[model samples]
Target chain A: MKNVGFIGWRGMVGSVLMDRMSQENDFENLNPVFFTTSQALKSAFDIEELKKLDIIVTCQGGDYTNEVYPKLKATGWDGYWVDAASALRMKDDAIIVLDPVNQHVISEGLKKGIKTFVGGNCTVSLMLMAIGGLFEKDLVEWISVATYQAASGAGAKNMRELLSQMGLLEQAVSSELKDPASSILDIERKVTAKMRADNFPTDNFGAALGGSLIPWIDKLLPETGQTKDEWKGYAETNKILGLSDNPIPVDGLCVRIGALRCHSQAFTIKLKKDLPLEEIEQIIASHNEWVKVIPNDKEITLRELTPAKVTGTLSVPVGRLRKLAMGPEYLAAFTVGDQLLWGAAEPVRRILKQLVA
Target chain B: MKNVGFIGWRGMVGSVLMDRMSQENDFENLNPVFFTTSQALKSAFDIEELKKLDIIVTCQGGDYTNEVYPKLKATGWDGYWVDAASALRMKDDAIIVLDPVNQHVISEGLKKGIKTFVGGNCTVSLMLMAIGGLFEKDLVEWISVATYQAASGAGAKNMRELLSQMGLLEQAVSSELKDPASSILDIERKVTAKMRADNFPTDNFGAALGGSLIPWIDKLLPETGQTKDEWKGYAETNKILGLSDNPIPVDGLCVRIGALRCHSQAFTIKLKKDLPLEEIEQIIASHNEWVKVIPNDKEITLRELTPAKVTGTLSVPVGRLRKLAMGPEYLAAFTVGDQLLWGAAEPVRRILKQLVA
Candidate 1:
């Protein structure tokens, strides 16, 4: 059994990790030490406590990692460290991991004694889950993605805020419906005013996330005119695909829609060469065990392919594949995946398992 | 004053036309005769009745157009025939009119004595209203548009059906929230079942249009793997641009989102050459009196740019213009317009005024 320590075990993502771990019986052969950050820790024992574990999984925010990582390194405690945060993703020493896309590279890094493995962005991870088949076969030359992201990507507080805002909207709409004098226009004005008011928790999301979509997510990169969320689709995707030297072009417009958990994306991909539709479908289906390629006869519908449908599951549903009339090499597809599972926690557990094995 | 006869004035588009005409005082110089088609029209009187009128505006469906257009032409009563339906849009004798985009062509056709003018499709008209300046300047090379269409595009019945579906979803969600035993999954399943069940009206849309989006719209063309709505963006746009001889490529994916009246589109345009951001913004701003270029600072939000906000107005709000990192020649932008106003009714009224001019 491997000795493991977990931080942020009560957080939204950490809770998801524990749930998935329990369901999969991942802790059967492993001994785990749960650390709660609610109380002040004895600073002297922090590095000493971490040194005793064979592996440490962190779901904590960036500040905790920034405080703990260098101190642990100074103590020369070089056991496996896996993170679900974005702090070390772009670091030269760390491997931004998506097991299905770059498990071979991860294994190679393990062999080379690399200790830190960071999870890629949630959007990046889910997208690779849906279309990693083509990336693996080196078929995709360029891709343009417009994302319909959910509230969970922002954090637990943001998710709760969105839900609360939605509740307000529903109440407002119901009130309007009850009174014939109230127009939809009036209901909208009330809801929008409440949504835009500086009343809710504005720490994570600045505006309301109910009955509306925000085109900007994360901080804007003034130099590039792209938000941090948009840049990750390119930077992290290339890193996880193990093609940092010459990456495929990915232009992403990441918008936060009024969905709950799963991130859905509409993608238009241009391939390096023309391929048959059947062959492309086969490639996507066979790319990963978790991907479910829904057939045309059972076309993707909101009922079967929504965030509400796929929020708690590991299955990444990909469907609505059609050849673009623009060219033989162009294809369009849609994808949905749980941002918490494949997007965040599952990758950390998978990497820890591989290291222990 | 010119004699004018209106057919199906109580139907959805006809009602919108009448509403806009009333607001704009479009009947100031014209003598009007309102014809209600609630009862079966006398077949012989249809052509005979139209003969005395200098202008006829028909807002009936395709069946009525197919039945009456041929007989009217046979009678040589071609004073002016305007239609709101799509039946004769592609015919050689009919000009698909959007005064802002193709008024020049309408003028040329009138000089040649072609008196039949048809309104462009709702999505097509809205898109052109926002971006026709570039097409007029010949600055655009190709465009790929993904539409977030409204329920009104399917007519009044579909609009009511969608609204009813939304009410059901909201009720289900609220009930689930009130009950501690009811999980969100349970609520989703219940709402989805009620949505997909054949109990609701399924005349225009096969499935639900409540808290979800439907990717398929209009009938599918078997040979092309594109829906009629998807094909119209390319065909009608080229025709209106006078680019039919050498049409610019437009790849459109028309989707029905749960909006009421306005249609929104996300566009990625590849221009003929690189242009300054200021120049592009200025071109879009000065395109038409009704086109409003929202600054990036304000951004496009549901409160300001949605169907609910623009439904009764003629303003077409276009914003979020930025140079795509993929290439300097590529640009990304978003646009929203009231489908009933600028898209359908206002155009007909504008053309009517022009004919009187």
Candidate 2:
């Protein structure tokens, strides 16, 4: 049997992936070993002994992937390597994937006898499935994106911290108030307003990003003016579109929003030629039955998008596709999804099917 | 004795200024006139007749200022000209005034016999006061501002629109026994997740700003690409520091958050010199005493800054000043204020004291 070991699979997104994998067992697999840390994994298996493994699935932190993966590869470990970290994110042959839109990319990796494939972070990949294909036709150009990303995106303990804070607020309100909605609204207003003025303590994010919008993101990159993350996005987008070696020009500004499970983007792309707005609209309408297109006769609008709803789901919801005033040369679209699925487990399964098919 | 006239005096900010000026007797030496529109103004007074008037303040729309001011000057109606519209916003000769911060600027106007003066809109002026002496020491630079600009900022009609929509939402909820927040949250999630794969109607803002972050400030020529309304920030900040031509750059982005009265800003600044972490904290703590800094820091991790709390108050609260890990050269500060007071009325009253003094 092919052995597959998962590193740090006890986390939220990892646990969700595990839960989904339990229902699917069509491919040849081994009892996956799980470790919370590299030290733990090292304690459990010497790298040489673990080399007998057919494939390694790592859902570890960027530090671990960056430092540990190269070490494992140096040991003449001939097995496959699948990492869910941005460490090797832009490696040409590494296969950065999202299962729904980039399934073909995974299949190609499998066909090439590639054992090492990785997924993008949960938010971007997840939402791409909702409308990434339609966006390729150059219908969306520029969009305004407001996100409510949760603390969990930073780490697992963040989820607990948020939940605990929320639970305490719930309990405190229940003991004193008859109607908690007003109090909840009041608290929301209070926290939100305080953030406007430099009044809150920010320990986790280095600055206060809780109720306020934090524009800078993707700290793990070189300052040489080229983003390693941007390179990954380019390669991944190219791969998803099956344009692997094509020189594609793409720029994106990513930020962490106040959201827990779902990640969303209001992405805009320019078109080379004018496509009939109605046909483009129709293509968007029938792109995927599950990914609903908000029907707006005049203009498209969405008030909110939360990961909690999309966390367990496969589809990415997209809305607000429209013509930019800059003229027909531009298209604007926004999409959202659960990062863990489309970004991780789903892509892994697709790769497996490719290898087994 | 002087005859003074104003337009848009009944507006939210203007009304506050009028209230502040209610008990002033210096104006008893002058007969004041108010006009709603230029056409009405033109019909009421011929240019030659208006020239005899001591001061003329134009607070109508930009079109009104452009059309009427030139017409007034051409017709010899030049007792003194004070334009409160974006029409002359870029004119270097036109003093961009915020009374407390730019009180010296007002003296410059008076010295030039331009007793006629204009006021910046509410939040812009308020932020000038809200920031106080921070900008003087090169203690701050670029700002990330989030404003809950009230419907009142848009005019009385917007206030009515907000009230009507709020009533509709209230009726649609409790009257139907519907869970408002959950339903709204769900709708928001669906909208974002789906990314407007379906049509979501938008009525409040035109297609340009509906369901988007609309920059609500004026962009004047002198400030390059910055909004015209934002230039007042530079002028006022410099004036408050007693520097008429301060080099401290005040570039910022102001977004309209969903709030009706008080405006909020999430700010990060680059200090020329290193500020000790504790000193910065102490500075904000001391600053908040005169300008309302919110409470609850002693008990909770953070406090909320809501528009409802300080909607009618003179206290502009600030919180959450902290050190950035990136470098000590950068410091982050956030501030909020009642736009009506600090932005408009308070500045006007502060300037009005010139006559009283």
Candidate 3:
């Protein structure tokens, strides 16, 4: 039997992993153990006892991962290690897993008995999930993404704060509407002023994320003038695509919008060569399992292809694909995918399933 | 003294024009008469009576403009005609006025005694207001814009509908929160289901536009794969810049987000040549009255530079300008402006001031 343990079963991503695995009946061949925190793990098993587990899936926060991972490796644990955070993603030995985009690299690493694989960042993973077919065929030359990310990408607390702020704004608007004399613009200013005072219930997000947008996500790296989250779109995309040399460059602006779950991205891509739009559509459609190409039709509007429509699913819905008037070699498209699924937990679960099989 | 008559003065754009004109004391040298509707015009002014005025300002809906403008011209009316709608924006005889970008063209048209001048579209006008300093110097090459427009751009009723939807969603979330056992996801699904039903109190916008984005704005032109609003960005930018012979091309995606007054745009632009980022900052900053460049400081976050913050003022705040990683020649920037002021009424009032002078 495969012995598996979870280090953060109570957290957002960990709970998602548990739910997905349960739905797929993935626990049939495994012995599962759950720990809600590092404190709980201390009472349950010593590092020596933990080494006996065949696979360890971690969705814990970064500090827990940083503190416990080296110790686990030092204990001579050679079994599978799957991480659902950025903690080990850039480590030289750890493979960033997204099977559809770089399955060959994972299979080769497996053949070489590689023990650790980390999940890619949510935006990068979802981006590749939507357009991996084009990348696979080497048709994409350069890509630029403008993301409309959800509050959940930060954490559950951030998501809760966003909802609370929305409620707060809602009440404010309702109260204003009751007075026919009050202008909506005046009320908007007052509500935003309260939010700007940093008066929301969030330690994860620095500002209010309801009815507004925050262009800066993650910590800013002043040296490069890019946030760490934005840099990952450039660097980790190359790493996950297994293109260490001469990789297709991705420039990103990871703005946080008011969505709760899925991240929506608007993309402009330059191709390596000119191709018919129909052929490109065919290539996208053929990636049937994960990528759903929403056809352009009058009956179906763009509002139907939003985060609210696609949240809680594994499918990445890609639409608004049109040849840019700029040139024949450029294309514009929009995609939305659940940050918890393609972005985090599901990738970890899928990798673990492969290891067990 | 100049005599002027107004059409559609009771509507959104017309009211904004009246407010700005009143605020600026623009009517000091003029005699003003207001008409609430086209029917009011039928009773108040025949073609002979209209021809007697020195200026006629029209902010009526497109159908009103189309019905009245030709009759005014055919009656041998030798007065200045200022229009705030798109009805005459593309006519060969008309000039799209934003004084800073193409004052010389407007002056030339006036010297030749041309009568008709139309205000540019909100997105186009606000875009130039933010970046026309560079465009006027012929420094810009190609631009791609992604817009986050507010409801006020549609009309007063649309803005009210957006706020009403926010109130409905707020009540729904508040009700859900009262039930301790209700999950946020289930609540989100319920709220979204109601929204996905496309139920809202709007004739201008067919869908609910609170806490969500509609990627389709204006009517879709399926054969060209562009909405009317998107096409305006491409076509009107050239016309307003007086680049009819060989216009600078713009590619755009016009989207409506959950804001009430101002429109925000994220732009990626390719320059004609490489230049220092500070030089660009200086060029943008020097345009003192209308464009405000927010500095990169910890105290000034992106949150402070949003639609909610910049809604009422004439200032178009431009910030987050950085060199795109794609190449040395490319730059990315974010901007927000009041859709009514700089986008509509202010431009109209300024042009009328110039004509009377």
Candidate 4:
């Protein structure tokens, strides 16, 4: 068994990763060591356990990655690095892993002695999971995604903040919500006002994400006026596919909605050629075991393709597939996935499994 | 002053319409009568009070429009029929009301004795409100809208169902939410379990809309597999523009989210030619008085362009405007508006104000 060091095992994504490993009893195959930044608070030291590991995985955050990664590399450690942080993602050395879609890229990287494997962006990974078949077939030209991201995509605090905000609104309107004939305006007015209250819990999110949605995610890229999160769609998706030199155009507004941990995205992909709906469905469904092609029927869409249903599950339900009235080459799809499962934790876990199995 | 009759004044849009009318003192300009379809119970009659009104306005659902509209016309009642329902909206003689953008069409309709005035669909009306200038300038080639609609856009019950579902999820995870160290996956498992439980309150929606979202809104249009909600984007917009002959292409998915009454739309608009961001901003902002152009700046977007901030306000804040990497001609914008405001009640109220101001 390989000695494995795991940092960030207690944070949102880290906890989910730990839970998944625990459920699978994956720890039996490796000698596991857990570490945190605050080992009695962060004073930099040469950590021997971290340096001695044959493999290391971290989902702590970009800050932790920045602080610890280079220090270990400086010690001449030659271990495989599996990361869920984006700090080192765009580096020339890292391979973004979504094995179902990008195992070829990962395999090629392995052949070339690449040891760093990072997961793709949440939206990008989920998008690729559903539409990787199309991309692999060389059928997609360009992509535009509008995201309805869950609060947990940001962190545990964000999920808690969203729930607190929702609880506050429901509490304020409890009386109105009880009465069917109560004025919806009165209820809405109170909820809206509560959301804008000076004392509303705007700590983690500087705005309310419960009764409303935030249009921008992460920091703004001053150069191109795109959000860092939105920028990752093009930067990371192409990198995952090993297509960075001639990157596919993938751009749209990224939005944060009030779901728990499942992120939903609406995609408008321009196909390289006009294809019939049946062929498109086959391409999407046959991509991987997890990516489902839900029927365009309303009942099935309502039943399956939603954050509510997809939250705790690994199912990447992609539906609402249809050719747009714009042109036969334009395709639209809606997909929902457990962001922590596939978007953050699962990819790295799967990568580790593949390496050690 | 025209004798005006108001029916369905107690429902969701109806209540908002009534409130707006009272705020504007719109009722003072005319002799007003209020009636209900069920006068104690479901019995239809040609009431003398209803027959005497020169203008009849209904915010009731389609069944009410279907029942009373033809009856009024058959009685030699040549008076105006203003509706917020889509029942008579597609009729050959109806003119959709959106006075700010389509007063010219309304004026032409009046000249031709087009007696029925219907409000546009929620997404369509708000879309027009934000981007009317671009359409007027002939810069728009086609529009693809991905919507994040609120519960109250459906009805009062849907809003309550969303709130209740939110409350249920929060209650199930209250203690866990309070602790940052608590496993988010544990809390999420509970919430997701509660969401899918057999007893989960889904009376109004066949599923949950609070902790999650429904990708397909309204009934499916059998002909094209488009939701009736999505279909209205093209149909209602063209009808309101009086451009049925050479209609602009409009398509995309319509999704219902957890907000109260403000519907947020993310648009990937294909422009006829490349235009500067300044020119596009100027064109969109100058479209109407209510449509405020929010900057792409994150702070401004967080403060202004959200359902939480815009629900009770008439502000149609559009921001996140930029050209996609797909092409210079592909532009993206995010807009949020009070669905009951401009989406329904406001348009009818504004049109009545135009007729009687």
Best by DockQ: 4
lDDT of model 3 at position A180: 56
Which is the leading candidate under lDDT?
Answer: 4
Which model, 1 or 4, shows the larger TM-score? 4
Q: List candidate 2 segments past 4 Å from native.
A: A23-45, A135-148, A160-201, A220-232, A242-245, A285-290, A297-311, A353-357, B1-357
- TM-score of predicted chain A against the true chain A, for each candidate: 0.93, 0.76, 0.93, 0.96
Clashing pairs in 4: none
Residue-by-residue lDDT tens digits, candidate 3, A1-357 = 788887877677887888899999999968887655455243223576668789988888778778877888887778888899788888888899999778899998888878889999999999899887898889988887888888788876676667677666666556776765666556656665655554554455655566666777766677657778888988899989888787787986777777777788888888999999888988987854889887665336554567656778787888878877788888888888998898988889999898777
Provide the overall lDDT of each model, using Cα atoms, as 2-decimal numbers. 0.75, 0.50, 0.78, 0.85
What's the lDDT for residue A252 in model 1?
59
Scanning candidate 3 chain B in windows of ten residues, the lowest lDDT window is B36-45
DockQ of 4: 0.78
Better candidate by TM-score, 3 or 4:
4
Put down candidate 4 lDDT per residue, B1-357, tens digits, no spaces. Answer: 887778788888888898888998888888777776674522224545567778888887888778767776777877888899989888998889999999899998889988889988888999999889998998888988899988877777788888888888788888887766686667777888888899999978898888889897778776776888889888888898888899899999888898888899999999999888888999988878888988878788898888877877788888898888888899999899988889989989987876665
Which 10 consecutive positions of candidate 1 chain B have the poorest summed lDDT?
B37-46
Q: What docking grade does candidate 3 earn?
A: acceptable
Candidate 2 per-residue C-alpha lDDT over A1-357 given as tens digits, one digit per residue, 9 for 90 to 100: 566666766655555566667767633455565555454244323566557667777666677777777777888777777766667766765767655566565666777866577767554564456656455664443222223234545654443233232222223323323342233223333433444444333445543432233333443343322223323444455555666554344433344433445556544345657886566667765755557665432223323232333545776666545544334555555555665567566676555544444
Q: CA lDDT of A315 in candidate 1?
A: 91
**Alpha-carbon TM-score of each model against the true structure:** 0.88, 0.53, 0.94, 0.96
| DockQ, every prediction | 0.25, 0.05, 0.44, 0.78
